[PDB]
Ligand SMILES: *[C@@H]1O[C@H](CO)[C@@H](O)[C@H](O)[C@H]1NC(C)=O
Ligand SMILES: *[C@@H]1O[C@H](CO)[C@@H](O)[C@H](O)[C@H]1NC(C)=O
Ligand SMILES: *[C@@H]1O[C@H](CO)[C@@H](O)[C@H](O)[C@H]1NC(C)=O
């Protein structure tokens with residue numbers, strides 16, 4: 324029956340391909356007249372069309388470079404590959420989309436250039452400054468004769484490279500490398516320091532390796548005294564340690580989030596004392612190699628991408644471009660859908676997909692396949708179209724100016740210019756010539772269609788932009804980019820703003836729709852459905868947070884995931900009180916077999932709170 328390949332008044336092979344990626348064009352000359360030439364390939368074969376004449380391009384994502392992900396090579400012979408594939412050729416027909424995938428692995432023996440950026444401000448006592456030095460020495464000694472190479476920068480009011488990568492490779496001894504450090508005893512210009520590291524330290528001239536993953540360990544005891552941005556360090560993995568009394572308040576700790584990589588729970592470490600630097604190495608090493616985050620570079624306007632992530636145990640999480648909690652050697656995979664808007668005239672485009680901090684990347688070469696191959700057999704001024712009037716292109720007559728018709732015979736001088744006899748001709752947007760509608764020009768776009776009923780400028784708008792600027796208008800209907808859905812193309816496919824602290828989209832208690840959680844589990848609420856005093860498992864989950872946050876013990880403390888999973892503030896109380904229905908009371912026995920008692924409460928300002936009785940009830 325009817326079909327949009329047939330209901331658009333297409334009069335060429337190129338037009339036929341441009342109306343939809345599902346359309347095919349029949350071009351054999353010995354074809355019945357009343358048969359549509361632009362149709363589905365199946366219906367194009369319902370009537371006998373020559374198979375060598377059906378023009379039907381297929382989009383492809385052709386893998387070109389596919390060096391495998393490196394396993395456990397020790398001498399860095401044959402070189403390390405941490406992204407695969409490395410180069411893909413993407414060819415798209417008009418408005419089409421195409422899948423491809425990328426695999427990323429943090430290889431154990433992959434090179435790492437690590438820079439210590441350590442605070443030398445006037446707040447630090449001599450022994451505290453010395454404990455910062457001993458911590459840098461401890462990290463280096465435990466990573467001696469590995470793929471790690473090191474530099475160290477002291478920062479206060481100004482910045483000083485105390486030793487560079489070339490120094491480390493040559494001398495190796497941390498005692499000798501840091502023997503000449505003089506405590507600056509000034510301010511805490513953390514912005515300028517990080518910018519200094521990005522542009523002045525990670526340099527080949529100073530021994531930085533171009534293939535190495537870049538890591539920055541920042542050690543500080545006070546809030547920054549300068550301002551600005553650290554955009555120049557966005558391709559560096561940044562782990563910050565805030566030590567001491569000046570980071571007692573939650574507010575002060577959060578001022579460090581802007582300097583570290585995301586999320587803060589993995590890359591911001593708060594220590595109450597300097598003595599705890601002695602026990603940090605193992606946690607630190609796991610954290611700095613636990614995140615894979617894809618970044619898209621040089622994406623042309625006409626292309627759109629959406630991502631699904633496979634981070635753990637082959638589980639697909641849609642709408643995500645990153646993975647966290649990774650162990651060294653883990654492999655993650657992403658499924659990527661690329662879509663083009665229309666058909667760009669440009670020769671060839673290419674963008675890159677690269678994990679943050681990594682050298683290796685996937686280069687995606689993009690070409691477009693919008694023309695029919697039969698156009699190479701186009702004869703202008705053809706005897707098959709009247710007085711050489713036009714071209715016999717792919718089995719039809721592309722007529723010249725002034726005269727139209729099947730063979731370009733009708734000039735100035737019938738019936739079908741209206742869907743029925745009552746309506747005006749050509750939707751009052753075109754003129755009826757030679758029995759066909761020739762649509763008026765428009766200042767806002769193009770009017771097309773058999774009856775000039777289609778245009779590309781009257782789609783619904785959202786916030787002043789047609790199709791929210793995230794889709795193309797095709798005969799009054801928005802055709803959304805790959806990363807948008809909805810009648811208005813204003814519903815994002817991304818789900819990162821739905822990810823909850825427990826690692827599940829909408830805490831596993833709801834569904835992500837347009838990037839916002841719709842909570843389904845009864846009694847659940849909050850932005851990611853993470854608040855649920857009446858949920859039956861609330862006590863057993865909050866119990867682990869009382870252990871790690873208040874008592875510095877438990878599974879979450881040992882696994883270094885207390886910051887990740889435990890976002891509720893803890894308040895010590897002498898007793899639990901009647902705080903209303905938005906709470907639950909919990910008890911459990913500690914390893915001394917004394918009863919711990921606490922209340923999970925949801926506060927009217929939006930804060931989850933755990934009220935913990937100060938003294939456990941012992942025998
Ligand atoms: C790509 O793969 C996804 C799931 O992996 C599927 O939903 C989709 O239809 C596939 N094709 C395109 C063109 O995205
Ligand atoms: C992502 O998964 C959703 C289903 O969860 C699917 O509709 C979509 O096509 C997938 N996209 C890709 C690029 O795999
Ligand atoms: C999309 O636009 C429509 C119309 O303006 C609006 O009603 C709807 O809430 C929007 N959706 C989103 C997710 O912004």
Ligand SMILES: *[C@@H]1O[C@H](CO)[C@@H](O)[C@H](O)[C@H]1NC(C)=O
Nearest residue numbers: 899900901903904906907908
């Ligand atoms: C928690 O315990 C307090 C004190 O015994 C009590 O008043 C309150 O009703 C309890 N909360 C709930 C939600 O039952």
Ligand SMILES: [Mg+2]
Nearest residue numbers: 494499500502
């Ligand atoms: Mg020396």
Ligand SMILES: [Mg+2]
Nearest residue numbers: 444446544545
């Ligand atoms: Mg200080």
